[PDB]
Amino acid sequence: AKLVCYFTNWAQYRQGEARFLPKDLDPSLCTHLIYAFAGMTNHQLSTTEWNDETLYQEFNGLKKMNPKLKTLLAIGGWNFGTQKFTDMVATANNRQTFVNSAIRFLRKYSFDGLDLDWEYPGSQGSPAVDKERFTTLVQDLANAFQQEAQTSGKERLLLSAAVPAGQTYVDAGYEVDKIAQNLDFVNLMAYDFHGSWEKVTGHNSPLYKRQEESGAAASLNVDAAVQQWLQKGTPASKLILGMPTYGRSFTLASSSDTRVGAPATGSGTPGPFTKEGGMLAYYEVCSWKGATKQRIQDQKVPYIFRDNQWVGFDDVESFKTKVSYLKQKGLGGAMVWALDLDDFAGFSCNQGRYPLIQTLRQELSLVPRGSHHHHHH
Numbered sequence: 587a588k589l590v591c592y593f594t595n596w597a598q599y600r601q602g603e604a605r606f607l608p609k610d611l612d613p614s615l616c617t618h619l620i621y622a623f624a625g626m627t628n629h630q631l632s633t634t635e636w637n638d639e640t641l642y643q644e645f646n647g648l649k650k651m652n653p654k655l656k657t658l659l660a661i662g663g664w665n666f667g668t669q670k671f672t673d674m675v676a677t678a679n680n681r682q683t684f685v686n687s688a689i690r691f692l693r694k695y696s697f698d699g700l701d702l703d704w705e706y707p708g709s710q711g712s713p714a715v716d717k718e719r720f721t722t723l724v725q726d727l728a729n730a731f732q733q734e735a736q737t738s739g740k741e742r743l744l745l746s747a748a749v750p751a752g753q754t755y756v757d758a759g760y761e762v763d764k765i766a767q768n769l770d771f772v773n774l775m776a777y778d779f780h781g782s783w784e785k786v787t788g789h790n791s792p793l794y795k796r797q798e799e800s801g802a803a804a805s806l807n808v809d810a811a812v813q814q815w816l817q818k819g820t821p822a823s824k825l826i827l828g829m830p831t832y833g834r835s836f837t838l839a840s841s842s843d844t845r846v847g848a849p850a851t852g853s854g855t856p857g858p859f860t861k862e863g864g865m866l867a868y869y870e871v872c873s874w875k876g877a878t879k880q881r882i883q884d885q886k887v888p889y890i891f892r893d894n895q896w897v898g899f900d901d902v903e904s905f906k907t908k909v910s911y912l913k914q915k916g917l918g919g920a921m922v923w924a925l926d927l928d929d930f931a932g933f934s935c936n937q938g939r940y941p942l943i944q945t946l947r948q949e950l951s952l953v954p955r956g957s958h959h960h961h962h963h
């Protein structure tokens with residue numbers, strides 16, 4: 587099994603106990619650590635934060651303590667846009683420029699691979715031709731990584747991609763059966779299914795549909811997303827199920843209607859640390875005073891409300907349920923967004939350090955046998 591965990595290079599700017607750096611990283615927590623995010627300059631892989639080079643050394647230095655650990659660098663993300671990807675994949679020359687830059691960059695900074703996080707080929711302004719061009723990019727990278735291993739004698743660089751769960755995005759951008767052959771693993775973004783952009787409350791990451799749902803809405807859940815990627819040709823062993831250590835919040839139209847599907851007027855109040863309306867870290871929801879926690883029986887996930895605030899999130903129990911699910915489907919493991927959104931320092935939830943991600947590790951049977959300081963949940 588794999589446990590793929592994302593580090594984010596902006597978590598260093600959060601205040602107080604929520605501030606996260608590589609020193610808060612546990613080298614033996616995950617099997618693969620992915621660094622979000624790199625960018626692109628003149629079709630070449632580039633840093634995005636002023637101290638990335640410092641952080642790269644600390645991040646990849648974790649392998650000195652756990653030599654089994656693999657690291658990857660993720661390019662793109664949700665604020666990156668699409669135009670730079672579009673321009674880079676548009677010609678063989680630009681793809682070659684990018685591919686060679688990626689090999690050089692990853693080797694220089696001691697990363698073991700590249701994770702592609704384009705949001706998304708064929709959507710969000712990216713033209714329809716980018717679907718086939720993304721396939722070509724994936725093939726170009728896989729082939730060039732293979733060749734570099736042959737010629738250098740080094741362990742081959744890994745290639746992964748973070749891919750969407752929603753059928754509209756999948757069909758617009760992803761030749762699933764083709765790319766799955768060339769990717770080492772596929773990081774399924776099984777979250778952001780619902781959120782404050784919608785007029786009624788809904789859960790960030792429900793495992794199954796609600797009985798009431800129909801049409802396209804009935805596929806906005808983890809099980810449907812997993813089955814979608816499997817049926818479209820991803821080998822189960824390559825499919826890695828995303829797990830969110832965050833939730834999505836709503837302001838209710840009325841404090842007297844707190845159901846799933848209740849009317850909402852907009853985003854929930856921003857959290858005290860993450861400061862982004864509509865989103866909360868697990869550590870911002872786990873210890874919410876005077877709130878009422880509920881479970882969505884059909885969907886196997888919790889929500890919590892207080893006054894006119896409603897948040898759908900994941901807890902230890904839902905993570906256990908989802909790992910049981912992925913094992914039943916024979917998936918290659920779990921992926922988690924993100925290290926800095928779990929209670930990484932144990933400052934909030936009274937469940938020790940990394941309660942959610944330790945739960946993943948435990949349920950995947952990945953607890954190091956020589957481990958001393960882990961906490962079972």
Ligand SMILES: Nc1n[nH]c(N2CCC(N(CCc3ccc(Cl)cc3)Cc3ccccc3)CC2)n1
Binds near residue numbers: 832865867921
């Ligand atoms: N593997 C992987 N690669 N990329 C991803 N996902 C992780 C979840 C991201 N998704 C949530 C990121 C996010 C999570 C928690 C918080 Cl407090 C703030 C931001 C993007 C998002 C959507 C709506 C509003 C703001 C931002 C979207 C990218 N997963």
